[PDB]
């Protein structure tokens, strides 16, 4: 099988090459990563770029979705699109605005299977050598799914297991803190907080428990419980 | 009721004031719009300044925010609290189908909903809209939305000249990839991306409705979970 | 004469239309405004016919998906031949060191480079916004005197909110003091506030001095950055 | 003396480290460069900056990666490493000749240093090749030697050919342009315009553009004052 690997962090992220290497154990790997929708207003420029295992690669001056569209052109046919490993979580409400997820979604929109990968972080750096067996296990599992699939994956720095999950959906409380710069000019701090603890079975909960979280995603944002007849 | 009006095109967009004026027929309206990401800025302080509403528009207390549309919502709920409804738009440009995912206009409405309020995004597929002629339809759509059980989150697209209204579902089409190489006047190479949908928009969808000249109203969910694959059968 | 009017704040800015109307008292006006500051090269620019505001004289106009300089290049093409390029009225000052990187000035300079006369107009502020109805007589007076100059000219104009006079001026060139105040983001990570300040008051006769006095400042600009005194 | 080195291309540019290493032959070098590739000091929000490490193969220079503009780097650099005697910006990967000087972030950083009362110089290399910094090192050293004997403070814009054969003090090339608009349509029939304005004549002898075409390192002293004083009493 032929795999396109991309991301949101750009062609220099160590997360990108960790994903490329893991994927190479399952098929031929090609890389196209940024230097979130597909650019159509103007043309995009992309350039051959060296990998750090050698992977044919292009650094694209466009969005992660542009990378997918270009990658299909440069390396078609492609069977699977993998996006990440993003340095930083992509959990719950974060999925909406994730560039990493957008690339995987684009792949899905083109009729391919796809998955996004992110590692939640904060004060510690990802040890990709340590994460490798968990990446391979995850990939192995995703490749056993009925195709095509679209999955959002988050891996704790040091996994203890794997769980399929629902997206965490929590209400938020707005918090705004007025203030002023050392020069007296006014500004505002925003620190909205979730109203409750992440629920069991959710991506956020799973990661906090030390488990790899894999959430299957839907493309249809329609709330069918509110659809209406014509009046 | 108190209404916070925002948008993604900025404080000078005629679409913003059209929405604020329409909304004023239903309650107290306050404006917080960007001076020019769709998540709330938390890593650092954001600037916001009192802003004079346009001369040829009713007065509206207003702030121009140096942040995202979602920041405007967070800020607006603080300065004009309490707020019952968040209206975002009217965006100069459509927000249909796959577009909803990346819309800053929608992100603002969604933020209000994440805070527990009712919210709607409004967009016009563009020519340039004639908000004088769209007013009656903006009023009709708003009246209709205000009869809904609360809270609600709806994405509205008004064609340039509406001939009706329809509740619709989001168009979700598969696309075929189309890349066309080219070179600029200087001989440098580039790539045109022109992906195309595999089929015509289906009836009942937002794209179809707008193409038929109808105002489209799609109720949106926040949960992106594909609930049919939580316990997937795995090949042997 | 035929006048091309553009700006940096965009097609919806009230300062743009204030300048167009004023300019219409001196020749046929055409508008091309933004929907970087150099002309976009070997990279397609989009432009659309645009309707002039309800409460304003009719003006053929286009909104351009590009830079102020692009507006000038495209404007001379769609409305040729043009004799004068006016840029503004910018919402914000363009005094002293600010001129160098000003987008409003960049458009006027582009017009000069194409062999035409041009002027940039800006209204400094911070507290309130401009009342272009009040400034109209002063805009008309400025334009009138500007149009008695030998052509081609390149002039930078700053009009205080409530002007009580007009003076030709030279750009203020002050030395600045570096001021940096450390701070912390929510995670305790460090960031820095910058508040550089001028070392002395603006010299008499300079653009910044004139505005502080309440006068409309008109500075003729050079295109040559060479410091001949050191060659 | 103490030298702050920055650039427009960012902390990973080979151009930045070539300049830093060359400057190190003349004083203590400190680096503050953009996290990634406007030009004014940021005052709206505060700016983040992080200590940046030196690789195994290179000499160590205290350095910070700055999430702001080249001018922010100079302001921050003066704070974290002050007092600083000189500000060097570059070596930019691309030219900064003639009209380009106006919109150059490389030049903006040098100019910021000058506005702070320090001597400063911007360095750029017109490139379809990859600059050979080992081959340009001698020219960087010679140029610095020349700059360091000038009366201070100074502000100079330097452009080095890929393979220089000499050095020349020059004036900025200033040419009138001819507008060229070539319409087109994208694959979906939608119209657009190509801009290809061209200078009305070839670069004059003595100018920075001419010098570089000849194979010479071009050094142009710049002025901060944009006033055209020949038209003050029109
Ligand atoms: Mn990312
Ligand atoms: Mn918009
Ligand atoms: Mn401006
Ligand atoms: Mn550069």
Swiss-Prot record, chain B:
Q: Which InterPro entries match?
A: SurE, SurE-like_Pase/nucleotidase, SurE-like_sf
Molecular function via GO: 3'-nucleotidase activity; 5'-nucleotidase activity; exopolyphosphatase activity; metal ion binding; nucleotide binding
**Where along the chain is a divalent metal cation bound?**
8-9, 91
Name the domain of life.
Bacteria
Cofactors named for this entry: a divalent metal cation
Keywords from UniProt, A to Z, are: Cytoplasm, Hydrolase, Metal-binding, Nucleotide-binding, Plasmid
For this chain's record, the cofactor binding note is: Binds 1 divalent metal cation per subunit.
Q: Where in the cell is it found?
A: Cytoplasm
Q: What is its main location?
A: cytoplasm
Q: One GO term of the cellular component aspect? A: cytoplasm
Keyword NADP in record: no
Spell out the reaction equation it catalyses: a ribonucleoside 5'-phosphate + H2O = a ribonucleoside + phosphate
Known EC number:
3.1.3.5
Show the NCBIfam families listed in the entry: surE
Q: What does this protein do?
A: Nucleotidase that shows phosphatase activity on nucleoside 5'-monophosphates.
Q: Which family does it belong to?
A: Belongs to the SurE nucleotidase family.
Query: What is this protein's record name?
Result: 5'-nucleotidase SurE
* Organism, scientific name: Thermus thermophilus (strain ATCC 27634 / DSM 579 / HB8)
């Amino acid at each position: 099988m032929r795999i396109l690997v991309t991301n949101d962090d750009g062609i220099y992220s160590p997360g990108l090459w960790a994903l490329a290497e893991a994927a190479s154990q399952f098929g031929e790997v090609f890389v196209a990563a940024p230097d979130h929708a597909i650019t159509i207003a103007h043309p995009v420029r992309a350039y051959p770029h060296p990998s750090p295992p050698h992977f044919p690669a292009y650094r694209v001056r466009g969005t992660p979705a542009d990378c997918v569209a270009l990658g299909l052109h440069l390396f078609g046919p492609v069977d699977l699109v993998l996006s990440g490993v993003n340095l930083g979580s992509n959990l719950g409400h974060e999925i909406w605005h994730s560039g990493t997820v957008a690339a995987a979604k684009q792949g899905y929109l083109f009729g391919l299977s796809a998955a996004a990968f992110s590692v939640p972080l904060n004060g510690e750096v990802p040890d990709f050598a340590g994460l490798r067996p968990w990446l391979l296990r995850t990939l192995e599992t995703l490749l056993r799914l009925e195709r095509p699939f679209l999955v959002n994956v988050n891996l704790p720095l040091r996994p203890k297991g794997f769980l399929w999950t629902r997206q965490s959906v929590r209400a938020y409380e707005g918090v705004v803190i007025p203030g002023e710069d050392p020069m007296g000019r006014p500004f505002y701090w925003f620190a909205p907080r979730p109203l409750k603890e992440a629920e069991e079975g959710t991506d956020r909960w799973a990661v906090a428990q030390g488990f790899v979280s894999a959430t299957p995603l839907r493309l249809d944002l329609t709330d069918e419980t509110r659809l209406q007849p014509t009046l």
